[PDB]
């Protein structure tokens, strides 16, 4: 049986230098044949390509800073932020790599608590904001891009059907 | 300098193929195992295949979902990594990520591409357009665009009541 990734929670609500929690729950034992357990922690940030922060539960990838920690052991597996800053928000994936077929978690979106009022963006830096505004374009282009390629598959129907008559 | 590049994606009728390409550069091709990761909406991140070096006689591993249907290949002297891609169906939708494995059984994918972007139809307007008059055929068609630029404007205009909070906090400093 393939191993399955259990991502909890599946959005987790933040404030900026709140702490932060995500856990996976492997549905067998990961550990691989060589004695390693090689539990992965990703991060997809909006519009790009997801990249490897933690390797083998707990070690750091190079470049990681160090408010990132991952531990863990059996089938319940965490990530912690330990104060989170704008950089971190994103998708984060869980990643077993010691059973073929390797798979990844479900994914957790840490996200910026929004309330009531949009007051809380004026306790930002103006540099977090304009990160937050360039990450937003290509998250548009990428939902605009979805609805190109949808009518296009809506299109070729309609003109085979004209044609076979 | 390292730097992985995918192409070759693109519209699939249910039942086609198809071959992606992934150049490398910055590093050392021949030395790392190259993977095939791809990133649906429904099924979210999924492995897809993996080659290992010519030492290993070039060996593969594939996803169930994707055996003998997909055949993932490598060429070191262009330091390139392929996959061909046969009988997709519209479960095989996605990006297509080409991934490179850090080595030295310490961690995997270290370095992803940018992704490209196969999109297989589905194939169920094929089975309800066929009874349809063709002169019904030929307004459904001229009235997709209209309908395509409605949808485009609601995420444009999502978009603005997402920037104006933010775009107003700079300007209040």
């Known amino acids: 049986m393939d191993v399955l990734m259990t991502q909890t929670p599946l959005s987790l609500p933040v404030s900026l230098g709140d702490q932060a929690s995500i856990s996976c729950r492997s549905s067998?034992?990961?550990?691989?044949?060589?004695?390693?357990?090689?539990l992965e922690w990703y991060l997809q940030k909006p519009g790009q390509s997801p990249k490897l922060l933690i390797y083998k539960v707990s070690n750091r990838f190079s470049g990681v800073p160090d408010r990132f920690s991952g531990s863990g052991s059996g089938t319940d597996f965490t990530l912690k932020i330990s104060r989170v800053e704008a950089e971190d928000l994103g998708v984060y994936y869980c990643?077993?790599?010691?059973?073929?077929?390797?798979?990844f978690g479900g994914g957790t979106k840490l996200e910026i608590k929004r309330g009531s009022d949009y007051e809380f963006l004026k306790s930002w830096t103006v540099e977090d904001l304009q990160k937050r505004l360039l990450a937003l374009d290509p998250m548009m282009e990428q939902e605009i891009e979805e609805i190109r390629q949808k009518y296009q598959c809506k299109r070729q129907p309609i003109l085979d059907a004209i044609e076979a008559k | 300098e390292v730097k992985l590049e995918e192409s070759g994606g693109g519209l699939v009728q249910p039942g086609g193929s198809m071959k992606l390409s992934c150049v490398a550069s910055?590093?050392?091709?021949?030395?790392?195992?190259m993977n095939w990761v791809r990133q649906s909406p429904e099924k979210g991140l999924e492995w897809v295949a993996e080659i290992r070096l010519k030492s290993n006689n070039y060996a593969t591993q594939y996803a169930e979902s994707v055996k003998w249907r997909f055949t993932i290949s490598r060429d070191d002297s262009k330091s390139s990594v392929y996959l061909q891609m046969n009988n997709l169906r519209a479960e095989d939708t996605g990006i297509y990520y080409c991934?490179?494995?850090?080595?030295?059984?310490?961690?995997?994918?270290?370095?992803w591409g940018q992704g490209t972007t196969v999109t297989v139809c589905s194939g169920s307007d094929y089975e309800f357009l066929k009874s349809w008059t063709v002169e019904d055929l030929q307004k459904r068609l001229l009235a997709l665009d209209p309908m395509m630029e409605q949808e485009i404007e609601e995420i444009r205009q999502k978009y603005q009541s997402k920037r104006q909070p933010i775009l107003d906090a700079i300007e209040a400093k």
């Open positions: 990643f077993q790599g010691s059973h073929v077929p390797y798979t």
């Open positions: 991934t490179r494995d850090y080595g030295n059984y310490v961690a995997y994918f270290d370095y």
């Open positions: 910055g590093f050392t091709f021949s030395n790392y195992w």
């Open positions: 067998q034992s990961i550990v691989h044949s060589n004695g390693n357990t090689y």
